[PDB]
Design a protein around this nucleic acid. Structure first.
Lengths: 154, 122, 116, 57
RNA sequence: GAAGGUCACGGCGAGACGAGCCGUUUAUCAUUACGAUAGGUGUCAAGUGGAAGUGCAGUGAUGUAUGCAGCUGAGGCAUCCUAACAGACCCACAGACUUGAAC
RNA sequence: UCGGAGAGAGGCUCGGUGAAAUAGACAUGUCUGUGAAGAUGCGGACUACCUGCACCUGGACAGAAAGACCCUAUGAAGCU
RNA sequence: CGGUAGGGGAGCGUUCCGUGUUAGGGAGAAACGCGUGCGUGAGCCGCGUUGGACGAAGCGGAAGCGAGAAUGUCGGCUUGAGUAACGCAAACAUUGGUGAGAAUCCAAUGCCCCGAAAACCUAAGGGUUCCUCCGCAAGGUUCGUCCACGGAGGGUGAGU
RNA sequence: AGGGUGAAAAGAACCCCCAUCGGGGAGUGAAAUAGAACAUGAAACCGUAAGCUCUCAAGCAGUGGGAGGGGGACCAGACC
């Protein structure tokens, strides 16, 4: 809480300690507040174990990802085909008013974006030292933030 | 327009160039010679000897000190072009033109009037 | 960017990389300072220090494979008895880079590589 | 590929000339490096034993 | 002429160019503020693979012992020895009128 | 059939040199309807900060071509 | 007293000529502004600046008599543009020399390609482009102290 | 394709910057805001400086009404 950051630290002295990377807020669920100790653990002491927990990570990035990658379903040759296969398959009309039908599958770009996996049971859970084991999946590559919210199955 | 020195028939252009003088405008004789020597642009020459051309002479020819000098006017104009021909396809879609430049700047003293006044009782 | 990329492939085939590199290498341990792009500097950097650590171990095992890189039988013996022995106390940092004034008529990059 | 109909020329073209703003010395401060009296704008050789010099004392 | 931003530098499981993320040799101030982002190096793992040299058996080829040895790209830990320079600039000085609730 | 990855020449950025088809004029959004009757510029209404880069590329009956199709003009050029 | 094609009825201006070596001008045409006054209109009059020579009031006469479009003609100049391209994919770099500057010149150490070939010789053609000393704006779709570029000299001596 | 600086060129010594290309001064001339691209040198096109308008507003966008702003007025008189 020294290097880089500066203003977020001083703006945290308000009864609390050790600042993370990014402060995240929650909703109503009947819990403790800043009046007893002001410090949440990783036990939740209420969400109950055994149940499934959702994981919202950060998607990766393939740069200016094309359209054949955001759908993966376009035939095309290469050794003799003029479509070179990789081509988006040539979309669009030839003599029709309309309005290029916006929103249709196209190349575009890719980058960091929320994902969320939902469900997924758990095999092991530990507190204090902080550590959790999710049933595979786990959006994004190890190095994001994740919200690891309870479960909004409702 | 006190002293105006430069030249013409330069081998540069009118587009790529000029963008260098538009940064030295309203700048002192120093703030302009400390930036050109860092500009990775070819336009830096003969525009480099330019800022030095407008100066120095105005020091022994007229009554203008080395300081208080600032680029008043500056602009790049297109001179004479040559209609060249380059083959490509049956020779038809061609004209070719070499946008030459002959900028003409000028230096002059600076106005400003400062006169701080305070009271010191003892 | 390639997830976990290292060592630029330049704008020429692989076999074209292990050929030009052989130059900036010997020329570095034969003269001292060599001018080149910032990319090449970062590239040759490792290809040079990795050739110095070999001489530190001596023996012949680090001489047969080494010869596979450089061909000059004059600069080879050097490492096995010249400057590497000087770094016998220093773990790494065999090479040193530094940026300078842009090229002449060309944009960039530009830097001079020399042994510390 | 295709061909433009009416060429406005004026206006439009001019606006697309802002992105090419005067890039004054594209680099950091790298001001006076002490005992340099001037020195180039962009970073340059530091001060210490005669280094980078073709000849020595 | 601060907070902050920006630029540059060293890089990025983030990028066409910009943006965005981490860091800038006290690895920015106190209290340990948890502050090696990269290259190299050392160790380890993994992938090939049991090579060079030498000795021995055989006319030779070839093989055997040391050798499950050596080599070793982006993987992991560790290590900042090299480059991340001391600084600048940009951005300012509690900051409009009327009315209501307070004083 | 679901193709993916990698190595090159372009593409992208910067430095130097440096074209074209085309074009009455521009502050040239969508939609319904209307209109010598499938216009963004009419009318109503909805939507919409100003201005670039890269890419995909339907509209402007886009560009090049007073079409080789038909017909018209007691035209022309060959042939049978 | 709307007006197309058309018919009819009135005028301005431009070049030149007669009436003019009369008169206006170097105390000065032409080119641009302004007074936005004037006529139904195309325009006219006066004048400032710039500029450099003659031009020409009035009526009439004689005109090759004033067009923004005939995919017009000639010349110059915008836009797409500063997008593409910079022309087989036989990569390139470095230490020095010279120069204001050179990755591509020269010199040295190598890589790489070809190897009946992008070697040499010769005919046709081309025709002085060969060599040396200098210079470079233009010609070399980068620069260039480089060049088959330019400007000066030198050089093809067989009865077979 | 491509015309004429001026009467006579006195068509620019020297000095300063640059690579001893180019320019600016010093001078000559009634003039070079006439000098070898040179006379008078408009328009299309391409820029600088100054006043006003200009991000929540759209359609060959001018016109009629019309606030404010930068200047010029008259010893108000409400105008350019």
């Amino acid at each position: 809480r020294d290097r880089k950051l500066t203003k977020p630290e001083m703006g945290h002295l308000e009864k609390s300690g050790i600042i993370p990377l990014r402060h995240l807020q929650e909703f109503r669920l009947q819990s403790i507040d800043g009046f007893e100790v002001t410090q949440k653990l990783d036990f939740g002491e209420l969400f109950k174990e055994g149940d499934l927990v959702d994981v919202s990570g950060t998607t990766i990035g393939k740069g200016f990802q094309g359209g054949i990658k955001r759908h993966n379903f376009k035939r095309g040759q290469m050794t003799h085909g003029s479509k070179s296969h990789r081509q988006l398959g040539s979309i669009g009309a030839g003599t029709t008013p309309g309005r290029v039908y916006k929103g249709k599958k196209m190349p575009g770009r890719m980058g960091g974006t929320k994902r969320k996996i939902r469900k997924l049971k758990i095999v092991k859970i530990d507190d204090q030292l902080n550590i959790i084991m999710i049933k595979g999946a786990l959006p994004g590559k190890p190095g994001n933030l994740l919200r690891i919210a309870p479960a909004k199955i409702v | 327009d006190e002293i105006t020195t430069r030249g013409y028939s330069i081998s540069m252009s009118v587009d790529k160039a000029r963008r260098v003088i538009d940064q030295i405008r309203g700048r002192s004789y120093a703030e302009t010679l400390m930036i050109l020597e860092l500009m990775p642009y070819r336009a830096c020459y003969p525009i480099f000897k330019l800022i030095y051309s407008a100066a120095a002479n105005a020091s022994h020819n007229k009554q203008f000190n080395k300081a208080n000098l600032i680029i008043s006017k500056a602009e790049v104009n297109k001179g004479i072009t040559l209609k060249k021909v380059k083959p490509r396809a049956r020779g038809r879609s061609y004209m070719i033109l070499r946008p030459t430049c002959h900028i003409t700047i000028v230096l002059r003293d600076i106005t400003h009037f400062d006169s701080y006044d305070k009271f010191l009782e003892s | 960017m390639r997830h976990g990329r290292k060592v630029p492939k330049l704008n020429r085939p692989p076999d074209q990389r292990r050929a030009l590199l052989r130059g900036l290498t010997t020329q570095l341990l034969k003269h001292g300072r060599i001018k080149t792009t910032k990319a090449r500097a970062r590239a040759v950097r490792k290809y040079v220090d990795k050739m110095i650590t070999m001489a530190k171990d001596g023996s012949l095992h680090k001489r047969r494979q080494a010869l596979g890189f450089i061909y000059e039988k004059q600069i080879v013996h050097a490492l096995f008895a010249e400057v590497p022995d000087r770094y016998g106390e220093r773990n790494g940092g065999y090479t040193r880079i530094i940026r300078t004034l842009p090229r002449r008529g060309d944009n960039a990059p530009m830097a001079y590589i020399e042994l510390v | 590929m295709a061909v433009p109909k009416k060429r406005t020329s004026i206006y439009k073209k001019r606006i697309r000339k802002n992105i090419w703003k005067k890039k004054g010395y594209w680099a950091a401060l790298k001001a006076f490096s002490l005992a340099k009296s001037l020195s180039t704008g962009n970073s340059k050789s530091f001060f210490v034993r005669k280094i980078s010099n073709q000849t020595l004392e």
